[PDB]
Amino acid sequence: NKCDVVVVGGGISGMAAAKLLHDSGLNVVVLEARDRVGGRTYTLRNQKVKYVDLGGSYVGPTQNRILRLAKELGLETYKVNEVERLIHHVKGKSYPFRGPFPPVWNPITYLDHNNFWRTMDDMGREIPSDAPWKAPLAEEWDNMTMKELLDKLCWTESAKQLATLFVNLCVTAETHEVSALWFLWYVKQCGGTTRIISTTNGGQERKFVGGSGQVSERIMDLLGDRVKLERPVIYIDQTRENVLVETLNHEMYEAKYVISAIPPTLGMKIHFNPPLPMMRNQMITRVPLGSVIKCIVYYKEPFWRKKDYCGTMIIDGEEAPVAYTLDDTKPEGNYAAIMGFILAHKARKLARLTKEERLKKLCELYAKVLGSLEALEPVHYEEKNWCEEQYSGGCYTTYFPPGILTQYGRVLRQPVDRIYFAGTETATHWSGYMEGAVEAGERAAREILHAMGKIPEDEIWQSEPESVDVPAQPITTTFLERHLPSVPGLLRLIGLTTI
Amino acid sequence: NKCDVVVVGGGISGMAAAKLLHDSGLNVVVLEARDRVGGRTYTLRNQKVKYVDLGGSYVGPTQNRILRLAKELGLETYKVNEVERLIHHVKGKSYPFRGPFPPVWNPITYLDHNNFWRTMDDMGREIPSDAPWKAPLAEEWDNMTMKELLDKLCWTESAKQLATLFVNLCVTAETHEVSALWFLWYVKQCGGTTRIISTTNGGQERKFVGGSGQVSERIMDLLGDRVKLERPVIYIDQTRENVLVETLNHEMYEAKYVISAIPPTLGMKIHFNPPLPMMRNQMITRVPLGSVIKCIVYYKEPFWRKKDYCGTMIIDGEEAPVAYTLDDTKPEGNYAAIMGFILAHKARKLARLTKEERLKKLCELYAKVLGSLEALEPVHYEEKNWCEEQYSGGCYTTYFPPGILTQYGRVLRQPVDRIYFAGTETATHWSGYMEGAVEAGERAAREILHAMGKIPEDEIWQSEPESVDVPAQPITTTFLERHLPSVPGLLRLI
């Protein structure tokens, strides 16, 4: 019934917010729509897999908030396997390699690939993490899709194809679906291209022992009966002295403040009194989530390792159901498995098939890429299509179509009277990730603490000490990477010498 | 409590559906979120204006369903004033003209303008009205914005600017916000460029005497206590023998079938059991509505007529708050007024001002364009910002960003178990308009009649006889319009 703060949503963001407020001495209630906590994280447990993350899973260096929260809750990490060679599969052929980036030998194609990644980061440096709409060329960049940007930037099909794969994998959307400004912001706010794509020293370095679902579960344990499951919020009324929050199962909650810790568009599932301000009213209809099926195929042994493959495959081409895989074997070396993502339009297309049909397609692809008949002998399979989730809307996160970020971006975390906004989408560092969920939840909680006069303004945004367990190596470039010309740059140099 | 069909939404589409079902002998209930019917139509009445449409207003030739429904309800139309000259205001100067298209005098610019409009219609001919995703180049066209298309097509800035205005005015969205495939479909399904932009012989020919709100109001009169106001639907349960529909004020309704007659994205305001199928679940997060403020400035007399101007202004440029106006004077010649639309990003930008500040900006603009100090002396002002509406989401209609129509378009009117889908967004002719609302409402109603075994399959989609009161003249082109080369075409000949 009556409390200090109602938190809507029991994903990592809502749970982090509720924990901070509870630890500060406030009476909190978490209203969660599902019969479980965790949201876009979900750890399945059964005999065949022990445990498997079907949602968010990976953590890495510079993600210090999720690492600190998880450590406090008694969790540990382990390293994703990257000992052996990675594979880039292009035009029906596999090319083994080492390092974060697939190597290119052709001098022209090399210049083009080098320029693409460099330019992504160059453009990123002009975009403020906390206010992308303030970039000098914000409007110009926001009014084009990533498809248009790639068409302008990439002078080789090889670079364009890899860049396209990169976009699909990063944001589970097509290049023509997303704003260039928003995408460039997204990469920059994760620390740039190298940091976002890397396993070793990047976002995919580690997983939690026992699954990421334990983060939300263990906070629920701490909060006890304060977390209310199967309580979808339907109505928020701010016309009176205290805020009134109503659920689908007819219960009413009274609070001084509310934290909305749900994906921005899912705010549409709530009826507001008074109506939302114009800008937010329209913003929440303009911000979809991406499309992905996460698929895990289990084998008797991690047979790829014997061929000096780590299990990482970057797979180009329309025919391939999965464009990217990682070894998902347990740290102990058992429950051998390959994790793959079916991305964007392919998630839409292949959802039509049965689970068994998708398993067959994946195994046949992996057999081709790994050059191994053993890939045709799976022992188990698990998958989750996030497009079907009423209380997620998709995965991994919210994307912005052309024109939206400059027009509506300012609104994302602007309080509406006594409602404050959390959720990973409102983060300024690793927005879209579990790390961003923690940042946003704790920041929203502190906004309320400030509103109550409990903390000063300069304490709303708090820095995070670097993890001792997961140290971050700096991102470096070589002299040649910095100064080699683009393709048009080389042609301009040719045009001058000839004159 | 218990009925045959629950209709969610009491706009024109929901009302048309409910009327058809009621007239067929079925027990219907309409659940409407607001304290009024009409939705994206709203007629305000007061002493100063008599009546004014603040939402949808215009009807015209080929819109035979809305015309027939309105006639049956006892309504009449009158013609929007287009007797005198139209004005095109470009680079700070007014150029009076006659006919639907503003003239172009520079020869290269003429070729470019001619080619733009022609190409829009050429492309439209390859897009099926009932299945735009089946266009031969559907994917190619859906994967680019209208901005990209205009950049490719328009070899002059003059043509590009006018084309941009056209897009903003048609769909209350920026060229970079919308799919080219969807926009080309939208124009084609209204009958093409000439039909959509024209007052005389086009979509803006007429208004209803007394306001368009009377359509929904008079159907509410016919249905009596069957329309429930201030009943926002929050929950639909299809797990049992009968469908259960719950409202925010705690009431429960039981029906054999449901019609959803709300904008597609507003389906998000309803919690579903079982959950929606994947494709619809995601579709309804990908389909926003446009942004517009409709503004009506009142004057003592229709003074523009004395200068041989009809009141139509096409106003280019970023500085102008309003890009397009029409004379909104009553058929009797009193309550003189100019109607203008503040479109897309300008609706967002200028919403920050006060009502009085917007009035001043409009009056100063109209004084400039009409070249008349009389424009600085308004007697009254009314406006409505549709962006602020929880139960509309915007106006005039839903737009599709790049990539959405091909991936999710098939889902729009696909039934979900016992839920059928109406709303103007699901129409195949004048989708986006009051006409489309009637088409979709009646079609959804007939889908249910077929499901009940009351009518055969071939009766779900029904043709409409042409209005005797509002006859349609055919759209024609000249030999030169058809065969004159584009700018690149002329360069190839050189």
Ligand SMILES: *[C]C1=C([C])[C]=C2C(=[C]1)N([C][C]([O])[C]([O])[C]([O])[C]OP([O])(=O)OP([O])(=O)O[C][C]1O[C](N3[C]=NC4=C3N=[C]N=C4[N])[C]([O])[C]1[O])C1=NC(=O)[N]C(=O)C1=N2C#C[C][N][C]1[C][C]C2=[C][C]=C([O])[C]=C12
């Ligand atoms: C799904 C997914 C997947 C599949 C994957 C992934 C992911 C996902 N991610 C993301 C995460 O998960 C996120 O971010 C988080 O989780 C979020 O959180 P938040 O904010 O909290 O949210 P959520 O969860 O959603 O929650 C919410 C809640 O609420 C609720 N509700 C609703 N509604 C309502 C409610 N309640 C009451 N009422 C109402 N009305 C719900 O239910 C919930 O619960 C991730 N992340 C991380 O970190 N990591 C990872 O891993 C992940 N994942 C992914 C990844 C990928 N990666 C890849 C590989 C390679 C690469 C490269 C580059 C890039 O960029 C990427 C990549």
Ligand SMILES: *[C]C1=C([C])[C]=C2C(=[C]1)N([C][C]([O])[C]([O])[C]([O])[C]OP([O])(=O)OP([O])(=O)O[C][C]1O[C](N3[C]=NC4=C3N=[C]N=C4[N])[C]([O])[C]1[O])C1=NC(=O)[N]C(=O)C1=N2C#C[C][N][C]1[C][C]C2=[C][C]=C([O])[C]=C12
């Ligand atoms: C807003 C607007 C404006 C400002 C203007 C205009 C318009 C609009 N339009 C459109 C119309 O209005 C529409 O289409 C209709 O109305 C629609 O109908 P429907 O489908 O039925 O829908 P609605 O209304 O929305 O209804 C719905 C209902 O539902 C309800 N709900 C929600 N949610 C819910 C509910 N309930 C229960 N529960 C829940 N949950 C609500 O409340 C409602 O009631 C139009 N149209 C026509 O036809 N006409 C006109 O005029 C119009 N307008 C406009 C126009 C413009 N024009 C321009 C000038 C020049 C030009 C050229 C070209 C083009 O294209 C255009 C133009």
